[PDB]
């Protein structure tokens, strides 16, 4: 037991599947219930789950929950599917929620904290989701030289393909054109030939 | 000011790219001090003075206004307008004042 290291508050480590179902929706009680009810299916992200159910829209899953729960309205019903899917996986983001994270956090305005500590904790992490991060994030992987010769061809054909009008359309951001010239490599940081038969048709 | 406060025919628009430095601050350690003095001179003419809303100089050591564009987000949601204008310009409608 390291000094300064302590077991989390109330997180009873010595729990088992043999033990009864915990009576609280938490990160640990749910994934525990997911072990019993679902077996071992532990997806990485939410849309990994959709890939398993083979193309089920959220509102479709929002339907079946509205049946199990007649009290919620429709747009309340869909909210549950996102939760449980985001509870068992990494809670994910959307260009709508990346706006949702702003509206709630901007509404409160400036805090009465001593050094506006929260607002900085908000505004800093805010920048990290902006395109101007994935761009700069790519540069660090570019300077660290983890690409191959096949990628340079792919970056290059991204540069020829953009029109000078798009440059002045991207030089405004001063980051956006880097996202394009490094399009494929920005994602590659995350993630036998059979010729046509050439016979003589005559002989 | 040229663009939206004047007609398209009679407004002179100066382009940014044709400007000396592209019209923005050059990178700091690059241009032999040419650009740094401009913004410095610019800031030296654009720095405020006088007792603001919080009650101190704009250059005070502790009281800092415009924290994360609060005053910027403040005007952005209030809107510099008047109910009296909002009524009148509604009632005028399409017609020109002339």
């Amino acid at each position: 037991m390291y000094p300064g290291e302590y077991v989390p508050a109330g997180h009873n480590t010595l729990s088992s599947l043999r033990d009864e179902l915990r009576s609280d929706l938490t990160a640990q009680s749910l994934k525990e219930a997911w072990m019993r009810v679902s077996g071992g299916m532990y997806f990485k992200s939410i849309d990994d789950y959709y890939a398993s159910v083979d193309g089920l829209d959220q509102e479709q899953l929002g339907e079946i929950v509205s049946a199990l729960l007649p009290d919620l309205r429709k747009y309340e019903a869909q909210a549950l599917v996102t939760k449980v899917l985001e509870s068992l996986s990494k809670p994910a983001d959307s260009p709508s929620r990346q706006l949702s994270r702003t509206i709630t956090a901007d509404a409160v305005g400036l805090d009465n904290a001593p050094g506006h500590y929260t607002n900085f904790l908000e505004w800093m992490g805010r920048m990290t989701e902006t395109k101007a991060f994935k761009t700069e994030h790519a540069l660090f992987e570019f300077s660290r030289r983890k690409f191959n010769r096949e990628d340079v061809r792919v970056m290059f054909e991204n540069y020829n393909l953009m029109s000078k009008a798009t440059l002045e359309a991207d030089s405004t951001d001063s980051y956006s054109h880097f996202y394009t010239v490094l399009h494929d490599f920005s994602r590659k940081v995350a993630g036998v030939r059979i010729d046509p038969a050439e016979v003589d048709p005559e002989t | 000011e040229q663009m939206a406060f004047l007609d398209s025919s009679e407004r002179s628009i100066v382009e940014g790219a044709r400007l000396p430095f592209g019209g923005k601050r050059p990178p700091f350690g690059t241009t032999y001090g040419m650009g740094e003095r401009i913004s410095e001179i610019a800031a030296d003419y654009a720095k405020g003075f006088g007792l603001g809303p919080h009650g101190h100089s704009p250059q005070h050591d502790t009281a800092h206004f415009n924290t994360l564009e609060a005053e910027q987000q403040r005007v952005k949601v209030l809107g510099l307008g008047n109910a009296l204008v909002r009524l009148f310009h509604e009632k005028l409608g399409n017609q020109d004042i002339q």
Binding site: A169 | A4, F5, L6, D7, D96, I97
Partner: peptide, 25 residues
Amino acid sequence: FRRGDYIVGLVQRANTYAEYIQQDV
């Protein structure tokens, strides 16, 4: 404003280069 700032025009809504969102459609 009033002093200083169709069906086709609807299609455009949905310099040297912006001419073609007017033209090329």
